[PDB]
Symmetry: C3
Subunit: 104 residues, 3 copies
């Protein structure tokens, strides 16, 4: 269950690949710069959160497709809603870094 | 076509935000509360760590609520095919949102009560 | 206040159902209680105390959403006879990242604290 999903998300969508490399990249940047623990955590928790949400949205997209092939207005709403949840996570993480980084 | 997809899903997301605000009423109310909290945190005299924690905590609520709205949208969709509905998934979704708000409340209280006397 | 009690009730019904049905959620429940007690016990600043709790809270949030997704699939697969756990896999991956995030948070904070 755990690892099975992580791989499929990495093989299929760049939206997870781009954030995936970002997560690794963010951790490196956080550890290199001399900041306090709270700042170190907030920078990686933000980027990892986007990955967390992206995985959940990817689960939503998977269910919608399994049910039917009809272009229904409710199922289409679901994939859009989940897509918005990731957007906020991206926005939140971007806002997070900018606020914290502006010191440096 | 990677550059093209950047605006593709941007359209989906923006359409999702519109869809949430119009249909979901709980998203409307929390958004009011959240947007207020964000502005307050943006004008509060606090450190960057405190400022982020104040904004992120209420932002998560919006993120969770959106996922709950997506989940409910699937249950409501499936409700077309099958007559009976436990509502067990929707209850879990509501639970998740609750914990988010609880977290946001606890985060704010702890951060303020320390920052303040 | 007309409908907000109903919403909260739904949230309670879900929490109680998750506590009984899923024993993994039971483990995460104590983890939050632990995090709260540990953070309040140890002499730490507000920002650190929040991050310790918020991490474990985040896991619990994701687990509830994951359990909600699984509850959807378990309704579908029961009647469709179609059994492809693409959703339960991605859903479980999302929880794992929450776990990892909590561990790193607890590591990074406590390592700089001591
Ligand atoms: C350094 C701090 C800021 C960066 C780190 C935090 C943000 C996540 C990383 C990259 C954003 C670009 C990659 C994602 C591109 C869009 C993905 C997308 O739209 O995915 C479809 C849908 O929105 C969901 O399923």
């Amino acid at each position: 269950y755990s690892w099975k999903g992580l791989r499929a998300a990495w093989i299929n969508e760049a939206a997870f690949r781009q954030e995936g490399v970002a997560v690794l990249l963010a951790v490196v940047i956080a550890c290199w710069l001399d900041v306090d623990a709270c700042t170190r955590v907030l920078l990686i928790s933000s980027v990892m959160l986007v990955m967390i949400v992206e995985l959940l949205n990817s689960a939503i997209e998977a269910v919608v497709d399994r049910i039917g092939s009809e272009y229904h207005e409710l199922s289409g709403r679901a994939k859009d809603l989940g897509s918005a949840a990731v957007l906020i996570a991206i926005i939140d993480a971007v806002i997070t870094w900018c606020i914290l980084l502006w010191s440096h």
